[PDB]
């Protein structure tokens, strides 16, 4: 195994807004005088301490400003090694609204919005309409709509409702899924059918 190792080792790492991530860089070298160095390439570095672990970098109260690429560098015996890690800072609170608040037979459509979130790219941010856990068949998505409220986003997914039949399901469930490298979160909001 090569001399310079970082934990966690993944090339890109995720952290929640306002939360903290600590990254540990260590160098296995036989000569003393050996050292490593964290550096912020794209962003401000963060706080580095040299004792525990080996060289421990800590991002604290993470803001969107913390996202970006950082590298730890170190030489052993004349050979310089680097380890790059990219940090993603996301916002995904449990603020999921539905419109209408409750469904009345005769309602053509339903909308569900995830509030003050980021990122909002469909590969990471996805919506679903569910009934009894299963996606509601016949439901027709109209397409996401991205809006505002660091600047976060509100994202609205609208669904054309299918015939609900009898007995009408007791409720449908709007669900937002957040998928990022190493992250899968979901919030479900209820939709009472009256």
């Amino acid at each position: 195994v090569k001399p310079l190792q970082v934990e966690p080792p993944e090339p890109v790492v995720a952290v929640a807004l306002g939360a903290s991530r600590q990254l540990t860089c260590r160098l296995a070298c036989a000569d003393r005088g050996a050292s490593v160095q964290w550096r912020g390439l794209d962003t401000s570095l963060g706080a580095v301490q040299s004792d525990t672990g080996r060289s421990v970098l800590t991002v604290r109260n993470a803001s969107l400003s913390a996202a970006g690429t950082r590298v730890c560098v170190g030489s052993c015996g004349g050979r310089t090694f680097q380890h790059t890690v990219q940090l993603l800072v996301y916002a995904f609170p449990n603020q999921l609204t539905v419109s209408p608040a409750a469904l009345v037979p005769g309602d053509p459509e339903v909308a569900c919005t995830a509030h003050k979130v980021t990122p909002v790219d469909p590969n990471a941010l996805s919506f679903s309409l569910l009934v009894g856990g299963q996606e509601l068949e016949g439901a027709q998505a109209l397409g996401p709509e991205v809006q505002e409220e660091d600047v976060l986003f509100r994202v609205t997914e609208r669904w054309r409702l299918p015939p609900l039949g009898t007995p009408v399901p007791p409720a449908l469930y709007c669900q937002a899924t957040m998928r990022l490298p190493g992250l899968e979160l979901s919030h479900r909001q209820a939709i009472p059918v009256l």
């Epitope: 195994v1 090569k2 001399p3 310079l4 190792q5 970082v6 080792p9 090339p11 296995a28 005088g33 050292s35 160095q37 550096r39 390439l41 590298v71 560098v73 030489s75 015996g77 004349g78 050979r79 310089t80 090694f81 680097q82 380890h83 790059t84």
Partner: antibody, heavy 124, light 113 residues
Framework: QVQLVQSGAEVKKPGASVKVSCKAS????????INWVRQAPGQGLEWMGW????????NYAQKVQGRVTMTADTSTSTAYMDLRSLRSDDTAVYYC?????????????????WGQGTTVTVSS | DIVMTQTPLSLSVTPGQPASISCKSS???????????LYWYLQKPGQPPQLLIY???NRFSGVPDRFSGSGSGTDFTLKISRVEAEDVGIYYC?????????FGQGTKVEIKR
């Protein structure tokens, strides 16, 4: 495109001194070290010395130890080889090359990007 | 200093024919961390040196699969399944395990007509 641009050819008298520069662009200067390797006319390659950009540590080859100083300037992304007490037998093309690993530290590539070289003609 | 000896130091290759270069170090290039630090460089006429193979058998970006590096311990071989005119120049091996880094004398490759 990762690039190392060296200063122009030099003529110096025997016993003088010369400082060759190596300006870095297209990559992170501090994530790689810098080697200096020379080639005397119609001759093989020979490693001359090494500067660790991030730490300031160096290592010199026997042929230049005691009369060379190599450094790196993080303010201008430039590395220097300073060779004093010049000999006719120092006449050579001097190359600088970045030296380092893959971005994860996974593989050690060695010298994957080279400067165009600098002709140093030690002559009277 | 580790001594690197290439044999032969001159190759004349018929277009299409394979070429083989031996590189032997006076001591093993395997490190305690498991890596074997043997590297191949090519210097074409009038041009700066370029990385050809890293860690015994990994071809650098842009290096055709007709170049293949192999070996372990103190004996290594660079093979070229075919030698095109663009391949002519001087090939060097180099150890990167123990300072000072040392190169072979360089094997000169030329087309045989």
């Amino acid at each position: 495109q990762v690039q190392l641009v060296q200063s122009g050819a030099e003529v110096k008298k025997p016993g003088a001194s010369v400082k060759v520069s190596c300006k870095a662009s297209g990559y992170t200067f501090t994530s790689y070290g810098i080697n200096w390797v020379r080639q005397a006319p119609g001759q093989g390659l020979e490693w001359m010395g090494w500067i660790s950009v991030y730490s300031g540590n160096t290592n010199y080859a026997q042929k230049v130890q005691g009369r060379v100083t190599m450094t790196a300037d993080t303010s201008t992304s430039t590395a220097y080889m300073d060779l004093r007490s010049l000999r006719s037998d120092d006449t050579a093309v001097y190359y600088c090359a970045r030296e380092g690993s893959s971005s994860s530290g996974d593989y050690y590539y060695g010298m994957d990007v080279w400067g165009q070289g600098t002709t140093v003609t030690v002559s009277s | 200093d580790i001594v690197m000896t290439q044999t032969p130091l001159s190759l004349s290759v018929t277009p299409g024919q394979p070429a083989s270069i031996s590189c032997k170090s006076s001591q093993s290039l395997l490190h305690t961390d498991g890596t074997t630090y043997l590297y191949w460089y090519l210097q074409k006429p009038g041009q700066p040196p370029q990385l050809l193979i890293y860690e015994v058998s990994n071809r650098f970006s842009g290096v055709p699969d007709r170049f293949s590096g192999s070996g372990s311990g103190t004996d290594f071989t660079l093979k070229i399944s075919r030698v095109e005119a663009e391949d002519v120049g001087i090939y060097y091996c180099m150890q990167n395990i123990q300072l000072p880094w040392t190169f072979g004398q360089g094997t000169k490759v030329e087309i045989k007509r």
